[PDB]
Enzyme design. Structure first.
Site, short mmCIF file in Angstrom:
data_model
loop_
_atom_site.label_atom_id
_atom_site.label_comp_id
_atom_site.label_asym_id
_atom_site.label_seq_id
_atom_site.Cartn_x
_atom_site.Cartn_y
_atom_site.Cartn_z
N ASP A 8 11.36 -7.42 -13.57
CA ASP A 8 9.96 -7.09 -12.90
C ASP A 8 9.37 -6.28 -13.81
O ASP A 8 9.01 -5.39 -13.13
CB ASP A 8 9.50 -7.43 -11.42
CG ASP A 8 7.83 -7.35 -12.12
OD1 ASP A 8 7.14 -7.71 -12.37
OD2 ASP A 8 7.60 -7.25 -10.96
N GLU A 32 1.06 -0.74 -0.23
CA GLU A 32 -0.16 -0.44 0.23
C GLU A 32 0.84 0.94 -0.22
O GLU A 32 1.37 1.65 1.00
CB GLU A 32 -0.55 -0.28 1.33
CG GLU A 32 -2.24 -1.23 1.33
CD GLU A 32 -3.20 -1.01 1.97
OE1 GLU A 32 -2.31 -0.31 3.45
OE2 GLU A 32 -4.22 -1.64 1.76
#
Ligand code: 7EY
Ligand code: CL
Ligand code: CL
Ligand code: CL
Ligand code: CL
Ligand code: CL
Length: 329
Positions: free
Chosen positions: A154, A50
């Site tokens: 990634d 988050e």
């Protein structure tokens, strides 16, 4: 057994460094004070983290806080050690602090915020020049961390944030990054499906920095052809099927026979035979302004089955696709 592989450039970067540089398991994390950071508002979210806008009450400067998922403690030290070594590098975020205990002891990353810069996620509404320009900026970050002996593993549009008003780019989310060591076998559960290189889809563990170059090619293909994702697979097997339907099964089998890779008996049968479809068949009337002879040649030298034949980050920066872009800088 599978034939080993080594990186063409930046091979022994970590060998020349001191042990403390890359041995993140032996690293002792210098945790800061959570009280120094008060969360202002929520920016994004996700299962892995988050993200929050915050302010450091000690110096009254704005920062960005990323509350990490309950991941294994070893991966926490890995990401923190990697961000600390990449500090100051071009187009890479700058770790400012590391705090804990927000809700029952949870690691949180504090990143620097650049003044008067509204960073948004990378999209597909860019012109031909902006694609070239922002690809070169990503190449800066990939070349820097590769030269620091670090694979990102990634690379995807969701991990590239843009500021179209100031021409600023950042490569983010280093939770999957890892140090490269020649001869080391690596986890193949890295990157998202649409950006996994052939080395991951065939479970070849001895890969290197060139994994990020394939992931970068998938982005370039989707941007110039206006088709996201370019390789749209539904599972890991279908992903290599879609790639085979474009790059042909010819160079794929020569890639499997070179490194002595062992596939599943049913996998070798379901791939079949496919001809190398041209890059110009994906060019339609909508995207005919983003495609150029340089773009197709550059994309071709990135999307290679053999990771050792793909372009390095610097070789890509030397490609004529960016010729006028580097003269502008
Ligand atoms: C300079 C910088 C700092 C933090 C991030 C970032 C890392 S993860 C992440 N997740 C959502 N947004 C951001 S930036 C949000 C706008 C801003 O305040 O800069 C980031 C990206 C770039
Ligand atoms: Cl994405
Ligand atoms: Cl991040
Ligand atoms: Cl790994
Ligand atoms: Cl597809
Ligand atoms: Cl490289």
């Amino acid at each position: 057994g599978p034939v080993p592989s080594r990186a063409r450039v930046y091979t022994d970067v970590n060998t020349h460094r001191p042990r403390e540089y890359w041995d993140y398991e032996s690293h002792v994390v210098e945790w800061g004070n959570q009280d120094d950071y008060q969360l202002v508002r929520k920016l994004g979210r996700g299962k892995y983290s988050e993200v929050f806008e915050a302010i450091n009450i000690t110096n009254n400067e704005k920062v960005v806080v990323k509350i990490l998922k309950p991941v294994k403690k070893k991966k926490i030290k890995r990401e923190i050690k990697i961000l600390e070594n990449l500090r100051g590098g071009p187009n890479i975020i700058t770790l400012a602090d590391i705090v804990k205990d927000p809700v029952s002891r949870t690691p949180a990353l504090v990143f620097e915020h650049v003044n008067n810069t509204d960073f948004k996620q990378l999209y597909q509404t860019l012109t031909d020049y902006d694609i070239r320009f922002y690809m070169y900026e990503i190449l800066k970050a990939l070349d820097y961390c590769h030269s620091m002996g670090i694979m990102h593993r990634d690379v995807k549009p969701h991990n590239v944030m843009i500021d179209h008003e100031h021409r600023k780019l950042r490569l983010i989310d280093w939770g999957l990054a890892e140090f490269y060591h020649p001869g080391q076998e690596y986890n193949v559960r890295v990157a998202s499906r649409y950006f996994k290189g052939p080395e991951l889809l065939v479970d070849y563990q001895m890969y290197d920095y060139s994994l990020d170059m394939w992931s970068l090619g998938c982005m370039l293909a989707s941007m110039i052809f206006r088709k996201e994702p370019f390789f749209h697979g539904h599972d890991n097997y279908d992903q290599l099927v879609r790639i085979a339907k474009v790059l042909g099964t010819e160079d794929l089998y020569d890639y499997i026979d070179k490194y002595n890779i062992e596939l599943d008996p049913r996998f070798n049968d379901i791939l079949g035979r496919h001809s190398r479809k041209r890059w110009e068949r994906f060019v339609h009337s909508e995207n005919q302004h983003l495609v150029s002879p340089e773009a197709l040649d550059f994309l071709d030298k990135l999307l290679r089955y053999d990771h050792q034949s793909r372009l390095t980050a610097r070789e890509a920066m030397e490609h004529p696709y960016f010729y006028t872009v580097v003269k502008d800088q």
